[PDB]
Design a binder for these strands. Structure first.
Lengths: 107, 107
DNA sequence: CGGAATGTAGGC
DNA sequence: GCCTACATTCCG
């Protein structure tokens, strides 16, 4: 439909949801995946899982239009898998780091 | 072998971990449980899972004494299970509601 | 205790 | 439908 705005994507975060973007190297390139945690703690990685979640709980403030799985949407916490001699290692990115990482997964 | 400070239990939150306290109606009474998320997104509910995770991952600033499974330690995000005629909703507590939930599960 | 066996859920 | 990855159970 219409692309969701930062503000709409921040809405479920005021009603007990968490949003994360997680970046790592695959086949050719670096890619991002978006995770959501529902207020009960359930991890969801696919849009239709959120649709199934929303229809199983009471329809209030939070609707499908507030959800984006786009790793380019700078809302929530960002993390990246860095390969090192000590092993694969996840680090949370600073606000200042996020823009370079979104540029690197656009396309 | 000695009590961990709030400052120390907040430290892994500055290194890509998350702590949550979740308060549900149990068998008899209201009880809380503590979850940690490792920087990789792994959910851990028991202290021996954390020690096992620390032993198989790069040993940076975060060490075993920075961790508490106490639902009466006000560090991280708090959620409670609120049952109504509309159904079981989980809701995130404000900073202002937290001290009264902790009192209610002290005891 | 640290790993293997088995169960489960969601991904493809 | 099976497969992969995670959660839980089981073992000496």
């Amino acid at each position: 439909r219409r692309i969701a705005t930062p503000e709409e994507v921040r809405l479920p975060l005021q009603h007990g949801w968490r949003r994360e973007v997680r970046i790592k190297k695959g086949s050719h390139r670096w890619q991002g995946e978006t995770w959501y945690y529902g207020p009960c703690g359930k991890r969801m990685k696919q849009f239709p899982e959120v649709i199934k979640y929303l229809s199983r709980n009471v329809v209030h403030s939070v609707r499908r239009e507030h959800f984006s799985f786009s790793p380019r949407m700078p809302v929530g916490d960002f993390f990246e898998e860095r390969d090192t001699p000590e092993g694969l290692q996840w680090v949370q990115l600073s606000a200042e780091e996020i823009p370079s990482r979104i540029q690197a997964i656009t396309g």
